[PDB]
Design a protein around this ligand. Sequence first.
Ligand SMILES: CCc1ccc([C@H]2C[C@@H](C(F)(F)F)n3ncc(C(=O)O)c3N2)cc1
Ligand SMILES: CCc1ccc([C@H]2C[C@@H](C(F)(F)F)n3ncc(C(=O)O)c3N2)cc1
Ligand SMILES: CCc1ccc([C@H]2C[C@@H](C(F)(F)F)n3ncc(C(=O)O)c3N2)cc1
Lengths: 245, 245, 245
Amino acid sequence: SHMIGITQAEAVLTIELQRPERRNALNSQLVEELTQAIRKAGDGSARAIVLTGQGTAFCAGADLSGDAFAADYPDRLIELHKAMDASPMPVVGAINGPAIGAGLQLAMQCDLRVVAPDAFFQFPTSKYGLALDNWSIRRLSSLVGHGRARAMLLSAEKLTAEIALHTGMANRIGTLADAQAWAAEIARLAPLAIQHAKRVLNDDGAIEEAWPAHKELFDKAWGSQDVIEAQVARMEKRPPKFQGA
Amino acid sequence: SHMIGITQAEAVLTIELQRPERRNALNSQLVEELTQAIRKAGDGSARAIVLTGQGTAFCAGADLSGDAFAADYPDRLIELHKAMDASPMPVVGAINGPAIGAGLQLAMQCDLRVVAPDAFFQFPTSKYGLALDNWSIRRLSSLVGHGRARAMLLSAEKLTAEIALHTGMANRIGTLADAQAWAAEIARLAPLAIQHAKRVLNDDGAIEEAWPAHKELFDKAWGSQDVIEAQVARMEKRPPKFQGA
Amino acid sequence: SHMIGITQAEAVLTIELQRPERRNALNSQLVEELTQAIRKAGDGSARAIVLTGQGTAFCAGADLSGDAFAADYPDRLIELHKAMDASPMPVVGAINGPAIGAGLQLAMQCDLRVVAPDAFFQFPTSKYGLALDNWSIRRLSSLVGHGRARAMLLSAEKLTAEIALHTGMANRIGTLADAQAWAAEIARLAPLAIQHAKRVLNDDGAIEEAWPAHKELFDKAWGSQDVIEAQVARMEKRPPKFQGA
Ligand SMILES: CCc1ccc([C@H]2C[C@@H](C(F)(F)F)n3ncc(C(=O)O)c3N2)cc1
Ligand SMILES: CCc1ccc([C@H]2C[C@@H](C(F)(F)F)n3ncc(C(=O)O)c3N2)cc1
Ligand SMILES: CCc1ccc([C@H]2C[C@@H](C(F)(F)F)n3ncc(C(=O)O)c3N2)cc1
């Protein structure tokens, strides 16, 4: 079938994630469809995009079961981010609920964010033994400030909507309709001005290749027994006993 | 005549923009006079500068009509910024009212900012089809946070004095007299300490040459029909109809 | 004797500065002992460190009298920072009171900060004619925002606990016990995830070699008569009369 919905009102294209049965957690199909929707957003008269989730969550992470193309997922995910980064259109994220893990990455790749009052943002990587790419860390630091980024990454701290507004992670607190109204205003602005500013802003240095030591630690985390222990402990409904290996 | 006023009380030199008939919008003469005032600020016993505007605005942008040396304006403007950056003296901006476009650039080149309660900051570039230099974008991101910088640049969002205080764009809310009092305290501090910190702070990376793609998009914006359309639409008192070309 | 105390409750190691007779101001001995404590923190079962000061101050700066190894102090201080940066353990600073000069540097080298309501942070370098290393300036800018960093460095502005919470310099307002409770939660998280994120965060660019002009100005400040004048004026209980030389 299809895992997203696409609609257009005048010059604003709204893309809605439609996998609420997994709180919009990503898989290969959802990512592929999103990539195509972004790439084709300029086929009509659209001048702005609103990206949002169906139901209570914006995107709760990733869920690859039972994804017949799960091995392709990580690469397709990178392709989606490249498509958003390269789009001449501004993407307004209507963050309607929790944005967690891959969902937080996706929210951060939007150009602007309108956040529902009860939404929150989180990287629970420290609870699962995983490591992030450098852009995720740099862009987060730019949006919440270095100090809060340390807490989010080292302790799995949740960022509330209210604090997101304080830091600028949220540009506004509001609803999907609020996001669509703002997008309508943006769609009336000069496209080449928007395109230039978006490119320069995205080229602030957040797009960064992992240093050699970063890659070493990244691979050590991903190949560790602790990653397995976090998964087993969850299935057995008990606290994980991590060993640092 | 002259488009600025210069006065000194003890060790504080106050420079006032005096083109209130255009809300202190810059031209070649005003820029040249400001550059000279900054360069000569150390001829006396001055240890701090206060920069401010006459009337309701700090600086509402640029107005080159009918400037006999308008072709020279962009280069002279860069020279002014170089002079402020190179000055061993700390410049306290008493931002007495709106700082818009070139006025926001000028405010950001000050070392510290004391902002009047009703002042605001804005880059309305997206309403006019124009593109900014990279420093304007980087220094703005550092002062308001990356998230708010995206909104200011992509949607022409105004930054209020209250929010400026929250982000650190405003170091204090207050008046010209308040700025002059603080400058007096600063003038009693150790000059070589101030000089070192100013140089290192300004060398945070904001002074950045445009990347090749940035230059391409910058020139595309400036040479576009949309830039003309914004001007014509204003003269005809109607909404612009931008085409992205 | 010893100038620090070291205790462990389960998986949290608490290191306490114990020179309250100088408000925990550093010297060669205190720095050496701290370095050893950090290096050996992983000899037991510890997974997190809490760093704190005895009495009313976290660390009020440096006091090298009468330190028989004072000439070694600057190098040993750098060694301490290297040890904290290299530690696989997250260091939670329980900033129990003022963190000034070397004390602010030490607080900033912690991975997370829990700050007492009456604590404050300050670099009074401008009152003493001194210059800082580039990391101190970059890490401060990342924690309080560029705008407040300008005020702290150019005017010796104090950062209150409340404003520290706003900017993310403080992750939480609270007590030593509060810090120890949070550290206990962190000690249950996956160590390799924490290690990766800490390394990437610390490699944001704050660790920066002084540019040639920065070194020139740094040496000019440190060798100036104004540095001597600040010290003499203090001893004579009068305002300093700085000359910029
Ligand atoms: C060029 C625009 C851009 C920006 C950020 C990224 C991030 C996305 C992020 C995500 F998980 F979301 F896929 N990611 N994951 C791994 C990588 C990588 O580059 O190795 C990587 N790169 C990819 C592309
Ligand atoms: C070295 C200190 C410094 C810092 C920033 C700038 C900015 C100013 C800014 C302004 F419009 F204000 F003139 N500007 N405009 C164009 C450029 C440029 O460098 O191409 C440019 N460079 C110029 C000089
Ligand atoms: C590699 C981790 C790291 C990070 C910052 C520093 C700072 C500490 C700081 C302090 F005063 F605290 F010792 N400092 N002082 C001088 C220097 C230097 O590098 O020249 C310098 N370097 C040293 C080491």
